[PDB]
Amino acid sequence: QKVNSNGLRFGINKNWISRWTANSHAQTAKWLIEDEKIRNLFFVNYRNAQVSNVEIERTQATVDVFVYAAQPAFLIGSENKNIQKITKQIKQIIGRTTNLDLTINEIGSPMLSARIIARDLANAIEARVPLRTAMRQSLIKVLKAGANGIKVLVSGRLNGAEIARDKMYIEGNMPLSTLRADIDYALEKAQTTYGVIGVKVWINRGMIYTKGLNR
Amino acid sequence: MGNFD
Amino acid sequence: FEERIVKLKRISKTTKGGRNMRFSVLVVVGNRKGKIGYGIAKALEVPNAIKKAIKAAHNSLHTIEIHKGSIYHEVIGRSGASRVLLKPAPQGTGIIAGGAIRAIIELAGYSDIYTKNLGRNTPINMIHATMDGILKQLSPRRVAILRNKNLNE
Amino acid sequence: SLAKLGEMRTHVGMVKRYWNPKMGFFIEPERKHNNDHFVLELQRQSLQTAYNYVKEVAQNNGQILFVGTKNDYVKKLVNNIAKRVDVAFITQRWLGGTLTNFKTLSISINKLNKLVEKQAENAADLTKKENLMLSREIERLEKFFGGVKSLKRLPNLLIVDDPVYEKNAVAEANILRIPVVALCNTNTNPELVDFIIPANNHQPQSTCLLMNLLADAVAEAKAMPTMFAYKPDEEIQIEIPQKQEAPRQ
RNA sequence: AUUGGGCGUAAAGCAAGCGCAGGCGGAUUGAAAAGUCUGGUGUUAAAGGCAGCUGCUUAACAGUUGUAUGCAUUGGAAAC
RNA sequence: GGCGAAGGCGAAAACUUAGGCCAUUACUGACGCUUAGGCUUGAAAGUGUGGGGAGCAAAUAGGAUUAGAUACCCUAGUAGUCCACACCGUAAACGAUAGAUACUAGCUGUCGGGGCGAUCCCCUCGGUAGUGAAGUUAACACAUUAAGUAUCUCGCCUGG
RNA sequence: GGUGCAUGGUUGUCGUCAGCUCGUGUCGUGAGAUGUUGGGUUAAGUCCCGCAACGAGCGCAACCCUUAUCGUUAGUUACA
């Protein structure tokens, strides 16, 4: 029932994920419903790239999609065979008159981003791996990377019915109540063979003192 | 205990 | 040091709107040459409870002797209205006992022994009676020293 | 040669009929005083054993510990012993878990030292209120952990003025295999404490006498001059408010 | 529950008392010796049980030899 | 607080009578414990006969309350509650702990007897309470008056 | 179209109520208790003294926005 921890600090401690504008409510809706398609395509079609997030930047028929993925080569492909393919789906989903000029950059220490860790949890759980040991291995590997406390909780069919058997894990300082906290949040739908498994990860990534405003 | 060590 | 468990129990205490199902476990660990210790500990999940019990057990061990691979004189294990009988079996017969009794004796690296439960059978009282019987046992050398007939008589 | 019987003018006597019966082996048959008098020869051999063990421990290169909790005089007394011999101690309440567990207290003493060096290096660069509050928990940590800070492992040995009042401390010591020596009054339980010293702890003069001789018995092994130990005379007599009325209400 | 159970609150101390019969019962000396212990003798059918062996192609099985137990009587002992 | 084996016993007096406690060189000389069966006692209520009957008060009537009230409250009100002679033999008749014997830390009391001796205190032999060690106990708790260490005997128990 | 009595996600109430727990340790054969209890202090498990407990986490607190005063940078399409 509590508020999404991302939204409360979003816009005052975290820069927006898609900065653009157009003619007043004429086709701004079109641009939003279009670039969310690019975002979903990145997070869905290529699991193997572990894309942390995508930045969309439009101004009057130009677009630049900055991406931050742990493994850039899979998006690049072999001898650049996959980059041209992915950019042509981006084009055919955006049109033809607009330049694209995509860029892919590896993200330093990706394992401190809740998105890729939640994706790994989804992959492990969907693969019938025992959930407890997968949680422990992922939690230890994340914590060892030098971050602050973590919060991972999972609902859904934990290998059977009577779903009200949900496991939660909390391992240190992660203060929702503090706005100046620099907290990360993600969510994935581990589509198991028995239904839907929602995995949620909270990452505490150090104090964000003297930030002033968004980065 | 006899002694310490 | 085989640290074989004996019985996990889904114990629970009641709070307003819900039950704190916090299952525990009892474990027996033994070097198989004289070191014996048991650990009971309560925790929310199996592996952490197992680790707590193993730490509690291995923290507090104690020694015991070997008389031809077995006890040498009669004893009754009196502990909390739960008696267990130990008899010095002949060498060849081998271990014969229940769950907890076999766990304790085999983890002690023993051999042939005659056993029979009396009264209750809850595992913790079984363990307590067996340890009390096995440790209240006096060594023949010890009684010989406190006697004037120490010369094999 | 060592603490003749002449010093014993009032160091025997405790509240009447409040004595554990099993320890009567140290006490002669009762007189009309009903304040349990002692045998000073056994007292002397007990002190001799205590001395030759504490000297051995000190030359064994170990860490000993001091315990004091009674209202003022024993606390200031152990403070004087600590400022006279470089060795840990306790003044405030025994923490109830000081020795049986030490990781959860070693981390706290390490935090104490970290904050101490933080103040030692900071030139008040933090906020004035921040410096105030930091000094505030510094004061609290000095109050509670002032004594036990110059040690790494659990002490090889410890003393206590009164095992009865330090039932927690003596019990925790007995849980572990480390020995203990006590100033056992007539109400103590002899089988618990390892080494027994039947001295009267109610009279402050007796207390200061005994702990000063113990302190010099360890300081002579610490190469320091033994002011009250092996001193012939004219040094043992310490100032004292009127010391009488062994019975208490 | 003789080996081998309990009777405060879980089943179980009668409401209490006087008490026949019976059960148990201080110390010391002698005798007898019922019990008690041990010695001899007689006896306690075969099969079956145990063990070995023999013979069945081997166990299933058939057979051989040895093996307890109790009682009566007789010589002693004399702690209880 | 005291006495009685138990039920019980408290305004005063007389007669008869019980058992009890401490020291007993006295006497006798094992004459003791337990006790099936037998016998005696045994709170209240109840029964029979004659009295007695102030108050109280089953049952009963009435007034209230309630949805109803054959109850809780109130006003009456009978047996009975009391005494004399016979009977009933039950009770949470409890310390929910059968009797007897000896031993086993301690402390605080209290009452009876003896001595020292104004009480106050000292101790001795006993009863009666509280606290509390080991020990026991499933735990609660008991602990020199045991539910401990044992013995003798009786009675008793074998899921609801 | 059905199954919120298979669900994820989302939301309501207790309730912005001060409460909920964990690590080590101790006590108890055991569920469990001790921290969280005792005193003052607050809206608060807010703080601090006592304490066989020592610490730690979620929450509460503060970090955000917003109105209330003053100073500054700026001057229009205000104001003048």
Q: Domain ranges for chain A, please list them.
A: 15-108, 109-215
Determine how β-strand A150-154 pairs with β-strand A167-170. Answer: antiparallel
Q: How far apart are CA D158 and CA D176, in angstroms?
A: 12
- Whether D53 and B5 lie within 8 Å, measured CB to CB: no
Looking at residue C73, the DSSP 8-state letter turns out to be S
Pairing verdict, β D157-160 and D64-65:
parallel
Residue partners of A51: CB distance under 8 A and separation at least 6: A42, A43, A67, A68, A69, A75, A115
Q: Is the CB of A6 under 7 A from strand G?
A: no
> Which letter does DSSP use for residue C67 in this model?
B
SS3 D69: coil
Measured between alpha carbons, how far is D117 from D109 in angstroms, rounded to an integer? Answer: 12
Among candidate residues C38, C34, C43, the one with its CA nearest the CA of residue C58: C38
Kindly give, in sequence order, each residue whose CB lies less than 8 Å from that of residue C9, ignoring residues fewer than 6 positions away: C23, C24, C25, C26
For residue D45 the two structure tokens come to 């051999």
CA A81 vs CA A47, A48, A94: distances in Å: 18, 16, 20
Calpha distance A124→A129 (Å, rounded) = 6
Q: How many CB atoms lie within 10 A of CB D201?
A: 26
Scanning residues 95 through 114 of protein chain C, those with a beta carbon under 7 Å from any atom of strand F turn out to be none
Establish whether the CB of A170 is closer than 7 Å to any nucleic acid atom in strand G.
yes
- How many Å from the CA of D95 to C1' of G39? 20
Nearest DNA or RNA nucleotide to C60 (CA to C1'): G25
Please state, in angstroms and as integers, the Cα–Cα distance from residue A121 to each residue in A60, A126, A139, A146, following that order.
39, 8, 10, 20
Alpha helices (H) in C41-150, listed in sequence order: 46-59, 99-107, 123-136, 140-145
Sign for the CA dihedral angle at D175, D179, D185, D186 comes to positive
Closest residue to G24 measured CA to C1′ = D104
| Dist. CA C45–CA A128, nearest whole Å | 20
Q: What stretches of D58-175 adopt beta strand conformation (E)?
A: 64-65, 157-160
Specify whether the CB–CB gap between A57 and A19 falls below 8 A.
yes
CA dist., res. A139 & res. A151, Å (int): 9
Looking at chain D, which residue has its C-alpha nearest residue B2?
D53
- Residue A136: how many CB atoms within 10 A of its CB? 13
The total number of residues written for chain C in this structure: 153
Is residue A77 within 8 Å of A83, Cβ to Cβ?
yes
Bridge partners (DSSP) listed for residue C42: C24
Pairing label, strands C83-87, C114-117 = antiparallel
Helix (H) / strand (E) containing D41: helix D40-59
Which experimental method was this entry solved with? Answer: cryo-EM
CA of D116 vs C1' of F38, distance in Å?
95
Q: Measure CA of the first residue to CA of the last residue in chain C; give whole Å.
A: 37
Q: What type of residue is D63?
A: Q
Beta strands in D67-200 (DSSP E): 157-160, 181-183, 195-197
d(CA D173, CA D181): 10
Query: Touching check for D179 and chain B: CB below 8 Å?
Result: yes
How many residues are recorded in chain A?
215
Residues D123/D131, Cβ–Cβ less than 8 Å: no
* Centroid of chain to Cα D42: 21
Owner of token pair 């062994």? D246
Relative to beta strand C4-9, strand C36-42 is unpaired
Say whether residue D97 is in contact with chain B using an 8 A CB cutoff: no
- Is residue D74 a contact partner of residue D91, using CB atoms and an 8 Å limit? no
Give the C-alpha separation, D180 to D192, whole Å: 9
Contact D194 B3 (CB under 8 A): no
Secondary-structure breakdown of chain A: helix, strand, coil percentages, each rounded to the nearest 5: 35, 25, 40
Please state the φ and ψ torsions of residue D6, each to the nearest 5 degrees: -65, -30
Residue from D53, D153, D157 to probe the interface with B (highest B Cβ count within 10 Å): D53
| Cβ D243 vs Cβ D109: under 8 Å | no
- Show the 3-state SS of A147-174: CCCEEEEECCCCCCCCCCCCEEEECCCC
Is some CB atom of chain B closer than 8 A to the CB atom of D225? Answer: no
Residues in chain D: 249
Indicate the angle between helix axes A114-126 and A131-144, nearest 10 degrees.
160
CB of D21 nearer than 7 A to strand F = yes
- In chain C, positions 114-143 with C-beta closer than 7 Å to nucleic chain F are none
Give chains near B: 3+ CB pairs under 8 A: D
Q: Report the DSSP pairing between strands A167-170 and A63-69.
A: unpaired
- Determine whether the distance from the CB of D22 to the nearest atom of strand F is below 7 Å: yes
SS3 D166: coil
Q: How far apart are CA D97 and CA D68, in angstroms?
A: 16
Contacts of D56 in chain B (CB under 8 A): 3-4
Which nucleotides of chain G are near protein (any atom < 7 Å from a CB)?
6-14, 20-27, 29-33, 48-65
Structure-block tokens of residue A18: 């898609």
Residues near A84 by Cβ (< 8 Å), separated by ≥ 6? none
Count of CB atoms within 10 A of residue A66's CB? 13
User: Integer distance in angstroms from CA D169 to C1' F46?
Assistant: 71
Task: Show the tokens assigned to A181.
Answer: 């906290």
Residue pairs between chains B and D whose CB atoms are closer than 8 Å: 12
Distance linking the first and last C-alpha atoms of chain B? 10
Classify D124 in phi/psi space as left (phi over 0), alpha (psi -120 to 50) or beta.
left
Residue D54 to residues A54, B2, D78, D180: CA-CA distances in angstroms? 72, 12, 17, 11
